[PDB]
Ligand binder design. Sequence first.
Ligand code: SF4
Ligand code: FES
Ligand code: FES
Lengths: 411, 159
Amino acid sequence: XXXXXXXXXXXXXXXXXXXXXXXXXXXXXXXXXXXXXXXXXXXXXXXXXXXXXXXXXXXXXXXXXXXXXXXXXXXXXXXXXXXXXXXXXXXXXXXXXXXXXXXXXXXXXXXXXXXXXXXXXXXXXXXXXXXXXXXXXXXXXXXXXXXXXXXXXXXXXXXXXXXXXXXXXXXXXXXXXXXXXXXXXXXXXXXXXXXXXXXXXXXXXXXXXXXXXXXXXXXXXXXXXXXXXXXXXXXXXXXXXXXXXXXXXXXXXXXXXXXXXXXXXXXXXXXXXXXXXXXXXXXXXXXXXXXXXXXXXXXXXXXXXXXXXXXXXXXXXXXXXXXXXXXXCXXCXXCXXXXXXXXXXXXXXXXXXXXXXXXXXXXXXXXXXXXXXXCXXXXXXXXXXXXXXXXXXXXXXXXXXXXXXXXXXXX
Amino acid sequence: XXXXXXXXXXXXXXXXXXXXXXXXXXXXXXXXXXXXXXXXXXXXXXXXXXXXXXXXXXXXXXXXXXXXXXXXXXXXXXXXXXXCXXXXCXXXXXXXXXXXXXXXXXXXXXXXXXXXXXXXXXXXCXXXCXXXXXXXXXXXXXXXXXXXXXXXXXXXXXX
Ligand code: SF4
Ligand code: FES
Ligand code: FES
């Protein structure tokens, strides 16, 4: 775990290689990686960093990697934070030099505490490690690390919000037009990315770009941490190549029971937000990210939720929105409506009191709700809401027929 | 109603470091964090002086109090059982554990023991879904606990 495992993994062995590099060389180096965002944005990782292209501004730039993802799990991001922290650390040091930022801050998940501590402590061994700092790693560019505990915002998750959390002042999205994402949070240039990107990018660079990159369909580059939670015997994290069989994935899970088979029905592929699936749909994955969209899939989170056949469709999805209910940050006047309208609206369906049309109506709300937004997180949450109507609601439309039963049940 | 951040302040003083040049906002987050340790159920009086250390107007700090879920307004059972009620965990059937647990614990899901070692929370996503049920006890963590097992877990602190 701590430095020896850290020494032991032989992290930073590259780092020495790193000193010699080659950062412009590194940066294209990703492009061959053609590293897309691991969080789900997908923009060229090279593209994102490249965007810095800093030249000279008075202020220091800064880079930070989320360590915080609340997506509702599976907690893949957290697990990565725990097992081989340093490896993340090295990646942090290595990449950052690429952008040529003086130092980096990593902002962690609020729930974690004891979990958080090890990361700094591994972080502590770093100065102790003496790999880089001051004059560093035979590299003039400086190195600094700061990690900040957190308030606890799923809202804090938005990039504008994440940069803002560092701001620690009523996090909201900064203003979308204005970025220039790099400038100027914490008062200056600063690019951001999901942690897996932060670390994995470090290993790939050390490795020849092709080995990681060659792996999978050219829709998706290299490898991914998939995690699953379901009404099946095995749930957890499985580090797997992009583009494999879902049902094959189901088999790795040893998911219970069967599938399609006893019982249905749907899986929310990414995390929760992307469109849910159907039993017929499941044969399709193929979990390459590009693969999902055409489906209207979009397993950006890479943490599956199996939602079992023997349950109320309205019942699970509805419980799910609430979280969206908790979520609203407040920056958009409309999204207060956004959670509202849905959640209160959502409940009626779940109780089964409400009349036929309202199902249709909700749909209307969805697009308008989706009409425009500050976020983002909010938009994504709504969109997942949408697919609910098709398929499962398409099933729920029947489920609502069950509401009819409530209607029959009325007297 | 007279909180003092002085003796542990030197530790607090470092917190001052984290940003560069102007502003102490970065300290904000740190500061409140320091405080919850100082007293839980932290109080307005504590904030204001914290603002002085902070050097910002109360409402400014006050805006901060709203937003972060973490800071706690009054008092909690020193035991503060954060019980996740979100889908995934729900998908865990967890919910039954809490209900069974509430009966065992003794107060509506909303309240805390008159004994006051504990203070339940309905919590939303604890960001450990693969591990559900996940229970965050105080600073610490408990993972997928049997109802009998959950009772046993409550027990030991209870001692
Ligand atoms: S959509 Fe909601 S959560 Fe997103 S920025 Fe707007 S108010 Fe905040
Ligand atoms: S957003 Fe244009 S009026 Fe407030
Ligand atoms: S749902 Fe309970 S931890 Fe994510």
